[PDB]
Design a protein around this ligand. Structure first.
Ligand SMILES: [Zn+2]
Lengths: 105, 192, 171, 190, 243, 197
């Protein structure tokens, strides 16, 4: 098993997650338009999203437990997919944050 | 009127009592068959004939509690059932290792009878008893792994446990029935 | 069972009720027999009472608000890590109360989640019940996080294993 | 050397699998019961090890720092054999020793006791935080990315000095994602 | 070759105390594990108690003959036989007395219900009828004087079925039990109507879990954990037995 | 509030259940909670007086089709709850007394109510009625551990002198030891005079 061979599938699964729970797309676009307005109007929101980890569990438990137990192999594809989502919005690497129900962690 | 711990299961002693009612093959060391050229057994729970017609080292079959009562004295030797030998137990171990899902078809009394005969008839085995104890231990350990795998699939509906021993069942009974009962109660509560 | 003591105790736990009518004289539930209860009064009542006032009315006399023990917070905590969760600290009778709540309001989601919780905890409970001395701290911690329902199942199971081990090894 | 190590390991596997008193296989049962509650260790009474085969205890007491790792390895193999179905993972089990040998008071321990098993008593005056020690290092060469791994046993270790087939003067680095670690604590006994 | 096994069979063909003890063992094993109070084997128990009396009198007579060839071993087997047999009857009766303790009000309901297909004197022994009646009266007197004297006339009934919780405890009919699928008590698989072929051509019974609307094939000679109600009539006909 | 004393009483019930369930012997059951029971019974009498007051005032007619219906239903439910708590407590102590009857008396009295004392007497009379009737050939009050051995060694734990049995005697000399039929000494093992197996 080598991580690179599964990176693409992990990317598209997190992309499907972000497409499903569209509140994260709305958050990305809200940050972008806030920053664009404040850049032009002459203070800046960061390129960071807090995902409810419960949403990622209810979507795909395997990927969720991947984020929890093997983040070194699961956060980079998730952040790549998020950066690609931000790129897909109209006109820098985006980062992730987590909330909820960590259990034994 | 029935103790709390006997309410819905058998004690291990009761399991032994059940197993003790099985017939077993013995070599008598007394002669009771009278020649043509005195007390008879006169039982009511089991067949009287074999005990009344014993001859020394003509092997014959009697109920196990009588065989043990005779083997408490020197007056008998209890022949091990064919499965309780090194080669046969090794075949069952290989079956258990080869078929992860199934339990091997050891007889339902196997742990109980192994315990009984290793303690009360330690000198009657053709095989060295330390190897038989070792292989009985191998079997119980492997079967316990399979039990743990099985408990991952408890249901509100039913379960199947093809060749599990009477003692293994009785050990698990006040857990499996309780958990499947509570899964049923959760499930049926949801129905309109 | 009618005389099942752990059921009598579970019925004694309290749930959030919202009254749907202005009713004189019931103010003793609000600790004063001389005043009415009013519509949209929000009050905690024992389940043996709240179960009934939520069905008799027509609009029933009480609506039962979602209790915290079945809130989205607790359900998410259940759905991540069933064995690590301290159900006893959530509610000592959580399974009996979940069964009663599922029966009172037919709710497939909660029935599934509570079934999943019970099964996944039953595995760990059987592991600690099966392990015997020849108490271990890893067992001693886990038995704190068990409900009274689960403590009963544990004692019965562990006693069965211990009795079997006793019989096998002592002549 | 590893032929003799294999024979030592097999001897300990037989000690776990065969040692029995009054119809109970106490070490098989203890190992299983420990595995169920997920503590991966075994407590061995050295009276039983002596009683089983005093040659084994002679090997152990002659040089415990080489023999204890082999005993731990034997415990892992039996652990798998009694808890995982053969042909349908666990860490390296800690060996814990119980003993009734004559105590040496703390002030008498000196150069003659170096590398010997020792029994003593005292009062713990301090307990440090849980430092992390490697059991297994994943390793690779900084230049040619030759990849290997080093298993470590904590009885007295290093990285290799130069690459195992130019790679520069001191070439190896650790890969922490596939390396494995354990808790280590310091106590001060008075 | 021409098969002849039936010809050989028609040539070869040319109650017992042991079966009674085996039926007692079956009754005891089924009673201990079932939630319901099973019907009493009236005739079997009459015969067993007769045999215990006669065997005791025999052992007495032989002991007198010894006191007033002389091998003690058969007497020892007779003595410990009667001890083992009396243990089985004792355990069986004590168990179903405990069940009567649990279901005293439900059994009273079956007695009161004129529409019932079960009469209490089918289900219970004469001694169990005595025990049920007088234990019910004595417990009822205790709680009447202690407690129910002080309740209003709305609430003095001890068998209130309409209250906020039902006072009558009944058997948990869908309680899970272990069973071994005997098949018919005869070897005549061809004679059993419920028996049928499973996949792989091995016999079975199909039973329906009514809540789940699901069929399950109880194949002969294998062990299942089943809701008691779902198997209840197969158990009534000895096609399965509780482990 | 009207449910509380019932909850106190059934918490008492649960604690005495655990007390009995932790040991192999019959633990002597704790004191009968006369005070909490009297407080509950007085509370029930007050709830009865409230129903009487209300069913009087249904002649005066205040909003009775709902309001009197509600007050009546609530106080009725309070009485049902208090009955359930009282009967749960009494049924547990009944169960433990039945257990003790079969274990010993059918072969600490201050802690019972007088109803419970005469109940225990009547229940022992019932057990003896069973083992004295038909089925008499089985000592129905005997043990439920299966007979594993017919002959046993027994060590005399307390002195009792010369006693006869069916065809002989035992002189129960302190710290003597017999080898004897178990069925001839079982009564003395139950009565605590003989030690082994
Ligand atoms: Zn290199």
């Amino acid at each position: 098993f080598a991580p690179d061979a599964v990176f693409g599938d992990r990317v598209r699964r997190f992309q499907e997650f972000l497409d499903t729970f569209t509140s994260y797309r709305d958050s990305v676009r809200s940050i972008q338009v806030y920053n664009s307005n404040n850049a032009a109007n002459y203070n800046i929101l960061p390129h960071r999203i807090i995902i409810s980890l419960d949403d990622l569990r209810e979507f795909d438990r395997s990927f969720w437990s991947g984020i929890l137990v093997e983040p070194a192999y699961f956060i980079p594809p998730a952040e790549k997919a998020l950066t690609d989502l931000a790129d897909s919005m109209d006109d820098h690497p985006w980062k992730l944050s987590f909330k909820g129900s960590f259990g034994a962690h | 009127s029935l103790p709390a711990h006997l309410q819905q299961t058998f004690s291990p002693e009761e399991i032994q009592f059940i197993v003790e009612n099985e017939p077993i093959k013995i070599f008598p060391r007394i002669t009771t068959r009278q020649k043509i050229r005195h007390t008879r057994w006169q039982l009511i729970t089991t067949d009287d004939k074999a005990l009344n017609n014993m001859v020394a080292m003509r092997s014959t079959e009697v109920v196990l509690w009588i065989a043990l009562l005779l083997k408490q004295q020197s007056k008998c030797s209890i022949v091990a059932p064919q499965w309780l030998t090194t080669k046969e137990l090794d075949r069952k171990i290989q079956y258990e290792k080869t078929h992860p899902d199934r339990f091997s078809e050891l007889p339902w009394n196997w742990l109980v009878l192994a315990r009984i005969l290793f303690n009360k008839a330690k000198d009657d085995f053709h095989d060295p008893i330390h190897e038989l104890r070792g292989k009985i231990q191998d079997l119980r350990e492997i079967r316990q792994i399979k039990v743990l795998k099985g408990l991952k699939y408890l249901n509100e509906s039913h379960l199947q446990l093809d060749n599990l021993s009477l003692l293994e069942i009785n050990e698990l009974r006040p857990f499996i029935t309780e958990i499947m009962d509570k899964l049923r109660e959760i499930h049926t509560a949801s129905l309109t | 069972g009618y005389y099942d003591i752990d059921d009598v105790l579970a019925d004694g736990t309290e749930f959030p009720c919202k009254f749907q009518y202005d009713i004189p004289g019931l103010g003793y539930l609000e600790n004063n027999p001389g005043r009415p209860i009013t519509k949209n009064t929000k009050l905690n009542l024992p389940l043996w009472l709240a179960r009934i006032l939520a069905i008799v009315g027509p609009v029933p006399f009480v609506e039962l608000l979602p209790p915290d023990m079945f809130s989205t917070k607790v359900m998410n905590a259940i759905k991540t890590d069933p064995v690590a969760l301290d159900l006893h600290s959530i509610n000592s009778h959580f399974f009996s109360l979940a069964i009663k709540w599922i029966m009172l309001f037919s709710e497939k989601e909660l029935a599934n989640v509570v079934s999943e919780l019970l099964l996944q905890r039953a595995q760990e409970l059987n592991h600690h019940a099966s392990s015997l001395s020849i108490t271990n701290i890893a067992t001693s911690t886990f038995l704190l996080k068990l409900e009274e329902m689960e403590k009963e199942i544990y004692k019965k199971s562990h006693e069965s294993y211990k009795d079997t081990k006793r019989w096998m090894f002592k002549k | 050397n590893d032929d003799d190590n294999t024979e030592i390991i097999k001897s300990f596997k037989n000690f776990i699998l065969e040692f029995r008193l009054d119809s109970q296989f106490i070490y098989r049962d203890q190992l299983r019961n420990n595995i169920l509650v997920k503590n991966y260790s075994l407590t061995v009474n050295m009276e039983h090890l002596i009683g089983y085969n005093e040659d084994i205890y002679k090997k152990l007491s002659d040089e415990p720092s080489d023999i204890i790792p082999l005993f731990e390895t034997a415990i892992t193999q039996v652990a798998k054999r009694i808890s995982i179905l053969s042909r349908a993972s666990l860490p390296t089990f800690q060996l814990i020793l119980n003993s009734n040998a004559n105590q040496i008071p703390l002030r008498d321990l000196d150069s003659e006791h170096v590398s010997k098993i020792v029994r003593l008593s005292g009062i713990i005056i301090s307990t440090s935080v849980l430092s992390s020690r490697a059991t297994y290092l994943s390793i690779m060469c900084r230049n040619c990315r030759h990849t290997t791994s080093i298993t470590i046993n904590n009885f007295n270790v290093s990285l290799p000095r130069s690459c195992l087939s130019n790679c520069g003067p001191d070439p190896y680095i650790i890969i922490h994602e596939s390396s494995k670690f354990i808790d280590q604590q310091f106590l001060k006994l008075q | 070759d021409i098969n002849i096994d039936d010809i050989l069979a028609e040539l070869d063909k040319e109650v017992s105390p042991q079966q009674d003890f085996s039926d007692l063992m079956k009754s005891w094993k089924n009673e201990r594990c079932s939630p319901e109070l099973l019907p009493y084997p009236h005739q079997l128990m009459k015969r067993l108690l007769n045999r215990i009396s006669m065997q005791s009198q025999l052992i007495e007579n032989i002991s007198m003959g010894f006191l007033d060839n002389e091998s003690k071993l058969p007497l020892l087997c007779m003595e410990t036989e009667l001890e083992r047999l009396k243990f089985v009857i004792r355990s069986y009766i004590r168990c179903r007395l405990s069940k009567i303790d649990k279901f005293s009000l439900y059994l009273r309901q079956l007695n009161e219900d004129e529409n019932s297909l079960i009469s209490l004197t089918d289900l219970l022994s004469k001694d169990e009828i005595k025990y049920h009646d007088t234990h019910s009266l004595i417990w009822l007197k205790l709680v009447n004087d202690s407690i129910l004297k002080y309740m209003p006339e709305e609430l003095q009934a001890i068998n209130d079925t309409e209250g906020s919780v039902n006072m009558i405890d009944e058997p948990d009919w869908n309680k899970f039990v272990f069973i071994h699928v005997n098949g018919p008590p005869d070897g005549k698989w061809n004679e059993d109507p419920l028996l049928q072929e499973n996949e792989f051509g091995k016999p079975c019974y199909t039973v329906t879990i009514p809540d789940l609307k699901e069929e399950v094939e109880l194949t002969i000679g294998s062990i299942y954990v089943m809701r008691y109600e779902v198997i209840r009539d197969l158990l009534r006909d000895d096609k399965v037995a509780l482990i | 509030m009207y449910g509380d004393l019932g909850n106190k009483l059934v918490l008492e019930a649960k604690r005495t259940k655990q007390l009995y369930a932790r040991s192999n012997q019959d633990v002597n059951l704790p004191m009968y909670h006369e005070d909490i029971i009297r407080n509950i019974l007085k509370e029930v009498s007050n709830l009865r007086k409230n129903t009487e007051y209300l069913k009087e005032q249904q002649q005066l007619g205040m909003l009775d089709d709902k309001v009197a219906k509600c007050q009546y239903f609530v106080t009725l439910l309070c009485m049902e709850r208090n009955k359930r708590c009282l009967l749960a407590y009494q049924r547990l102590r009944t169960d433990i007394l039945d257990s003790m009857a079969w274990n010993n008396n059918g072969l600490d009295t201050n802690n019972l109510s007088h109803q419970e004392q005469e109940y225990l007497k009547e229940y022992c009379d019932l057990i003896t009625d069973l083992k004295s009737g038909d089925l008499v050939d089985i000592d129905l009050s005997g043990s439920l551990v299966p007979p594993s051995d017919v002959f046993i060694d027994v060590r005399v734990l307390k002195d009792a002198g010369e006693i006869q049995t069916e065809y002989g005697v035992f002189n129960l000399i302190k710290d003597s030891q017999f080898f004897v039929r178990q069925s001839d000494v079982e009564r003395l093992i139950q009565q605590g005079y003989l030690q082994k197996i």
